[PDB]
RNA sequence: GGAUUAAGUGUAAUCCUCUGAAGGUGGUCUCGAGCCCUAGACAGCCGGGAUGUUGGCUUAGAAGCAGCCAUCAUUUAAAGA
């Protein structure tokens, strides 16, 4: 934190778990919520979690804005409705300033090549129109879901549009 | 035991509490319950004949579980036929059906409130009286 | 624009913006002058007018000034009275009201009972009638409301204290009679 | 010619340089969507908010309105256990 010189991507590839190691292992619980299993698919009701934005949330961006999202989904009675899904996965891997690489900015260090950063933290990226993640049940309410998402959004850094079913 | 309370009459203690009081019944409960199935019918006397268990639990009566789901659905018969006629029978709370299983509950063997209530709804269905 | 005609028993005749009323009761007047507008004149009956103006802006005027007439024709005639009690917890409050606005003469004592008494204003041409008991009424009332108005109220308001809270001392005197 | 804006917003192409991201306004104009209306709407506006009965259960309480069950009947112009 914050998450400023992490979320925008100014760089190229890899997650590449042959050149990294030492990754965090992601604070992000499981990427399948509700009742899994039985296909959630035949619903009313659809779905949200448009991105509206560029990119790269973290893991600390997701893991705490999802599961945060769940928490006020348990309304419909802990196993009774709805599966959750999340999309994308925090591969790629972010590296941050450890004084050897360049100089300046991040991804720069001291020097003039050498230290990239040390490897600190993944997030995955998105693009203007993609769906964060998604899922929704018959009407249980006005929309307890759309109510998730309200709080699911407000933490990422992107404007997310709730986008109606 | 038994009194003769007017329909939509409770707690006095002179009347009501006393009596039943140091049997072991609790007032307060009767009074409401009582005066509540009694609303639909006001202003006559029904002869209560409560009956108190150790547990100094109590039920009372206007007897039968027919005869209380018509009293209770206020209508003096059952449907000609219990699953197309409803409406025209009649209907009753579901509080009532609670009322019912409880006051019958002496009488049932049903292992919670649940069952019994379900029990008299049983009857109930027969009769065309909807819940 | 618009034309108000009204009423007999009272007259109008306004010149150069200045505006009046006439009677029985006293006469009030309201210059009304603003942006180009005619402020209007009495046209051998009663006045009304219109400036060839633009839409809202002028509009919210010219509409204003209506308001402001009509009610300067009932201020004329029957006048305006706002009416209330006063009267709260332990001890009562005194509310008397003496020549003028000024301190030590519009009323108000012990508010819950405290010293030193807190009155002001009246406005220019009202009447502070008093209680029909002891203290349990008052009547405030003259041809203009708009002095009649915040007499009662600037009355009512110098009750309010912003202190405790308003619940738990619910003193003062209000006009809920309009 | 036409329309918006009431904040002096703005009168700032680009940028170390011109900030502003995930305070308020029934001031006014313009555009869209849902529902309700001459079987008469809003105000829509004005006024009113029945008996068994505090329905049964539960509970310290549970009285239309924590919860479970039932949701009948009466008197009605009408009014849900």
Known sequence: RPARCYRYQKNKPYPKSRYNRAVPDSKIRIYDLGKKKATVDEFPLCVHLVSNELEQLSSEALEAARICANKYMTTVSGRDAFHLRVRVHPFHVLRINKMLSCAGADRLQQGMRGAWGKPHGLAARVDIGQIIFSVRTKDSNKDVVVEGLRRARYKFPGQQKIILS | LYLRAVGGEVGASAALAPKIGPLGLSPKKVGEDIAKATKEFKGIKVTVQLKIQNRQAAASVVPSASSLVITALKEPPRDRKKDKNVKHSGNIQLDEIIEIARQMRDKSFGRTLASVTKEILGTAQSVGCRV | ?178
């Open chain 3, 1 to 178: 624009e618009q034309q108000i005609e009204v009423p007999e028993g009272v007259t109008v005749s306004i010149k150069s913006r200045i505006v009046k009323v006439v009677g029985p009761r006293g006469t009030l007047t309201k210059n009304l002058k603003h942006i180009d507008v005619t402020f209007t004149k009495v046209n051998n009956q009663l006045i009304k007018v219109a400036v060839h103006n633009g839409g809202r802006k002028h509009v919210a005027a010219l509409r204003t000034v209506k308001s402001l007439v009509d009610n300067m024709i009932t201020g004329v005639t029957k006048g305006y009275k706002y009416k209330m009690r006063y009267v709260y917890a332990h001890f009562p409050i005194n509310v008397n009201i003496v020549e003028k606005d000024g301190a030590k003469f519009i009323e108000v004592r012990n508010f819950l009972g405290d010293k030193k008494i807190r009155n002001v204003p009246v406005r220019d041409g009202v009447t502070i009638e008093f209680s029909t008991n002891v203290k349990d009424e008052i009547v405030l009332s003259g041809n203009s409301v708009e002095d009649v108005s915040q007499n009662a109220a600037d009355l009512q308001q110098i009750c309010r204290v912003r202190n405790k809270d308003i619940r738990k001392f619910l003193d003062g005197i209000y006009v809920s009679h309009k």
